[PDB]
UniProtKB/Swiss-Prot annotation, chain B:
GO terms for molecular function: rRNA binding; structural constituent of ribosome; tRNA binding. The keyword Transmembrane helix does not apply. This is Small ribosomal subunit protein uS13. The gene is rpsM. Located at the top of the head of the 30S subunit, it contacts several helices of the 16S rRNA. In the 70S ribosome it contacts the 23S rRNA (bridge B1a) and protein L5 of the 50S subunit (bridge B1b), connecting the 2 subunits; these bridges are implicated in subunit movement. Contacts the tRNAs in the A and P-sites. Gene3D superfamilies: 1.10.8.50, 30s ribosomal protein s13, domain 2. The keyword rRNA-binding applies. The lineage of its organism: Bacteria, Pseudomonadati, Pseudomonadota, Gammaproteobacteria, Moraxellales. Keywords: Ribonucleoprotein, Ribosomal protein, RNA-binding, rRNA-binding, tRNA-binding.
Swiss-Prot record, chain C:
GO terms for cellular component: cytoplasm; small ribosomal subunit. The keyword rRNA-binding applies. It comes from the Bacteria. This is Small ribosomal subunit protein uS19. One of its GO terms (biological process) is translation. The gene is rpsS.
UniProtKB/Swiss-Prot annotation, chain E:
GO terms for biological process: translation. GO terms for molecular function: rRNA binding; structural constituent of ribosome; tRNA binding. One of the primary rRNA binding proteins, it binds directly to 16S rRNA where it nucleates assembly of the head domain of the 30S subunit. Is located at the subunit interface close to the decoding center, probably blocks exit of the E-site tRNA. Keywords: Ribonucleoprotein, Ribosomal protein, RNA-binding, rRNA-binding, tRNA-binding. PROSITE patterns: RIBOSOMAL_S7 (PS00052). This is Small ribosomal subunit protein uS7. It comes from Acinetobacter baumannii (strain AB0057). Part of the 30S ribosomal subunit. Contacts proteins S9 and S11. One of its GO terms (cellular component) is small ribosomal subunit. SUPFAM superfamilies: Ribosomal protein S7. InterPro entries: Ribosomal_uS7, Ribosomal_uS7_bac/org-type, Ribosomal_uS7_CS, Ribosomal_uS7_dom, Ribosomal_uS7_dom_sf. Belongs to the universal ribosomal protein uS7 family. PANTHER family: RIBOSOMAL PROTEIN S7 (PTHR11205). Transmembrane segments: none annotated.
Curated annotation (Swiss-Prot), chain F:
NCBIfam families: PRK08881.1. The gene is rpsN. PROSITE patterns: RIBOSOMAL_S14 (PS00527). Binds 16S rRNA, required for the assembly of 30S particles and may also be responsible for determining the conformation of the 16S rRNA at the A site. This is Small ribosomal subunit protein uS14. Keywords: Ribonucleoprotein, Ribosomal protein, RNA-binding, rRNA-binding. Disulfide bonds: none annotated. One of its GO terms (molecular function) is rRNA binding. One of its GO terms (biological process) is translation. Belongs to the universal ribosomal protein uS14 family.
RNA sequence: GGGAACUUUAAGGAUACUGCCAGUGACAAACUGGAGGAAGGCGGGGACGACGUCAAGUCAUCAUGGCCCUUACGGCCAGGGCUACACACGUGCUACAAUGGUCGGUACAAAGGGUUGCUACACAGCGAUGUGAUGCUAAUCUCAAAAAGCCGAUCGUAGUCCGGAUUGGAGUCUGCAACUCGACUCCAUGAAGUCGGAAUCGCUAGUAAUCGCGGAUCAGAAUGCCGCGGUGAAUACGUUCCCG
């Protein structure tokens, strides 16, 4: 009863789905059943920044940043699956957490 | 009736009528009524003389009118004589608890005095 | 006000001075800048020169003053009228 | 048997329609228990009273989100969609009554420099 | 506006009587979005008038509305029909507000019955409009 | 800001970091129920006898580039002027103009 | 247990284009009415601000020409001040009550924050809070009680069971430290205020009005600012005058 949990975090959804698709494709090639990827709710943070150097309270820029999360489950893992997962490259801008 | 030297309203509930006495609020009235077992919705006009005497006995336990006013006056006079910061504010008839005075001190300063 | 579980607050350098005076009996005013120190029962009968931002004003401690801050008897602003 | 989904002001209602006596439960509660005000109860019942079919169907309803008015509107929309799914010939009558339209009105966001969506702070020439 | 003609906003019929007149009266009564309170006030008065004379609530209300309806404003000119009804409801709510009774519903029913016999501040204001129209 | 103010901030940070451990020890000893009232009392006296700059409440957040003491935005560590400039140049990952 | 139906979560797509019918305008650009459709003529909102004007604002974010100080106009420290108070003005909050106040019971959200943090539950306290303890690096645990709403009782038009300023007395918490000068809790007190002149402001639909909820800054300290949802109106004949 060994299950592998993969969590992906990023600031760029196109990157995060590219990485998730690559991981899923590799796992399917190795010969293990996978579940996902499952999109978790996105986090959004906003800021209001005054633009003028001295006094204009109504002159502000509104910025935002988003955090995207993906969840992937691997069930019935073959022996080659794990070593393939550490052989898999790490792309900048996407953070990966693996739990056994 | 007359309680503690005060004519409380006759056609009101007891818990509301007892608040007409200085030094007694809603919480104190509730506590007094619960200590003599009279329902809060009963008006004082359907109260027996014995119940009124019991209420008078309960009321005398707390400071109500003359002692309370005397003690407040003494407390203020002590500060004014000692000359601390609060005493000076009491002397000048200005806000005492750190409020702004550039505007909005009308309760302590009375109506506006033209220049 | 300061929580009762912590006790009153007195500056150590002022506490040492008053304790030394009371162990002795010197009537010399104690010069201090500690407007925030609490007046204790040991303070009664002493003269303390409290700073008020510009000068040191003398205060003679009586029984009625116990429980107050030293700064309440040294006003910092000057006002006489408009 | 038939299914419908209704939406109104962030409220979503799932409606399951069958044939029966007329039982109606919302979130394991009766209509009068769930809705306190009469107009909310009337809005829910409007489609069946219009069709004169108050007695031939049984309803199983769940609903989440929004307030009482939004939830009543969502339930009405879901019932209308369930009836349409059950019989396509009923669509002209319900569309004429106006029940098939999804009301897209929604709360407008607060805007920078304003107290509300449109309200502006008080201003003075003087 | 200046260039366009904006269509009037159609209001839904009252879900209990299917009466746009009753719905408009409820909207006139309602304050700051409290529709339930206005519904209770209006329905209570409609039931009260029904008991104090056994008449249909809708018909009795339309007849009283037509009685308290003006005919002219103020420069004399003929008031369009919608403004007539809008002005009659305002008078009927304003005058009903000033009576002395336990609830707004009872005051509304009482002055509806009073106006049904032509006795009320709304009808008096109507006669005032008649007089000042005779003035012009 | 001025070099004197920046150096003051640096000195206060150094003092806080130096005295961090003993302050926590004394606070734990004060909070200790099992310890004697006397132990807690001398613990409190020692805490009051610690230097003033050891207290974290005297630290003020300043911009990491200019030293400005207003508009800090803990997340980026920069004041509003530098945050605006750098975000609009594109050197902050993930931050974009916000519209909704 | 189980299921992959539904809601939702979130990536990619489809759809709306005067497409169809009728009348008009020139016979064009267009315009008016109807069907279908979730939506019909720009469906709603946001960001994006041409050539230029104001010697407009900022040498105190920063950079920079020139001028000035160099045992001081530089640097360090403790205490005080920026919180003053006969007055005038701007922007707000809370009220003057019955479409309401209080008490008991009982429903329905969205968005956002949490490891120097948020805390289930138990005990102690009238209460702010304290102690023990549990889960959470979070669609998993938590802040968290939504409030207006509905049902029942009571108050009966009174400066009141409206209002909640001011002051007296007890406390809690953050912090080395709440005197000048913090927030909150309890007992007592119970001010003006009866809908406000000349004049003047905002708003055309999920808008105005009203009700609550969250965050940045931040040891502590919002009636301000930036967001979120609940309930939900009235009126537009027209350009004769006011402003641009």
């Amino acid at each position: 009863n060994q299950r592998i949990r993969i969590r992906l975090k990023s600031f760029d959804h196109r990157l995060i789905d590219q990485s998730a698709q690559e991981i899923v494709e590799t796992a399917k090639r190795t010969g293990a059943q996978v579940c996902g990827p499952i999109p978790m709710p996105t986090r959004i943070e906003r800021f209001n920044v005054l633009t003028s150097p001295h006094v204009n309270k109504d002159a502000r820029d509104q910025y935002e940043i988003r955090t995207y999360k993906r969840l992937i489950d691997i069930v019935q893992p073959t022996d080659k699956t794990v070593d393939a997962l550490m052989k898999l490259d790490l792309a900048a801008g996407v953070d990966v957490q693996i739990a056994l | 009736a007359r309680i503690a030297g005060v004519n409380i309203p006759d056609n009101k509930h007891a818990v509301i009528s007892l608040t007409y006495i200085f030094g007694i609020g809603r919480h104190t009235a509730k506590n007094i009524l619960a200590a003599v077992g009279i329902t809060e919705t009963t008006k004082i006009r359907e109260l027996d003389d014995a119940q009124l005497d019991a209420i008078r006995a309960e009321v005398a336990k707390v400071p109500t009118e003359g002692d309370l006013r005397r003690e407040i006056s003494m407390n203020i006079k002590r500060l004014m004589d000692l000359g601390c910061y609060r005493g000076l504010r009491h002397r000048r008839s200005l806000p005492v608890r750190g409020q702004r005075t550039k505007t909005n001190a009308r309760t302590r300063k009375g109506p506006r005095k033209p220049i | 006000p300061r929580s009762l579980k912590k006790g009153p607050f007195v500056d150590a350098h002022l506490f040492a001075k008053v304790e030394a005076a009371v162990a002795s009996n010197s009537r010399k005013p104690i010069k201090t800048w500690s407007r925030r120190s609490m007046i204790l029962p040991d303070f009664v009968g002493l003269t303390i020169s409290v700073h008020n931002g510009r000068n040191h004003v003398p205060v003679i401690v009586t029984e009625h003053m116990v429980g107050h801050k030293l700064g309440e008897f040294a006003p910092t602003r000057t006002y006489r009228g408009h | 048997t038939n299914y419908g989904t209704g939406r109104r002001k962030t409220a979503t209602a799932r409606v399951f329609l069958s044939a029966g006596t007329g039982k109606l439960v919302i979130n394991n509660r009766t209509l009068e228990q769930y809705f306190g005000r009469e107009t909310a109860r009337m809005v829910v019942r409007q489609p069946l009273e219009l069709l004169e079919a108050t007695e031939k169907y049984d309803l199983y309803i769940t609903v989440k989100g929004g307030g009482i008015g939004g939830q009543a509107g969502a339930i009405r929309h879901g019932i209308t969609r369930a009836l349409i799914a059950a019989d396509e010939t009923l669509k002209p009558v319900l569309r004429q009554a106006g029940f098939v339209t999804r009301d897209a009105r929604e709360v407008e966001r607060k805007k920078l420099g304003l107290r509300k969506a449109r309200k502006r702070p008080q201003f003075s020439k003087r | 506006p200046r260039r366009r003609v904006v269509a009037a906003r159609e209001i839904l019929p009252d879900p209990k009587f299917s009466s746009q007149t009753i719905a408009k009266f409820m909207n006139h009564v309602m304050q700051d979005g409290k529709k339930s309170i206005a519904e209770s006030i209006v329905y209570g008065a409609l039931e009260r008038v029904q008991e104090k004379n056994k008449v249909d609530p809708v018909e009795f209300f339309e007849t009283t509305l037509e009685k308290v309806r003006p005919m002219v404003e103020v420069v004399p000119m003929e008031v369009r029909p919608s403004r007539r009804t809008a002005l009659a409801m305002r008078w009927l709510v304003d005058a009903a507000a000033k009576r002395s009774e336990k609830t707004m519903a009872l005051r509304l029913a009482g002055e509806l019955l009073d106006a049904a016999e032509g006795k009320g501040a709304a009808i008096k204001k109507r006669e005032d409009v008649h007089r000042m129209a005779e003035a012009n | 800001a001025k070099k004197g103010m920046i150096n003051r901030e640096l000195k206060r940070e150094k003092t806080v970091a130096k005295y961090a451990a003993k302050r926590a020890e004394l606070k734990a000893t004060i909070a200790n129920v099992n310890a004697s009232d006397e132990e807690r009392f001398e613990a409190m006296l020692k805490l009051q006898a610690l230097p003033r700059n050891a207290s974290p409440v005297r630290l003020r957040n300043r911009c990491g580039l200019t030293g400005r003491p207003h508009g800090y935005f803990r997340k980026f560590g920069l004041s509003r002027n530098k945050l605006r400039d750098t975000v609009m140049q594109g050197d902050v990952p993930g931050v974009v103009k916000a519209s909704w």
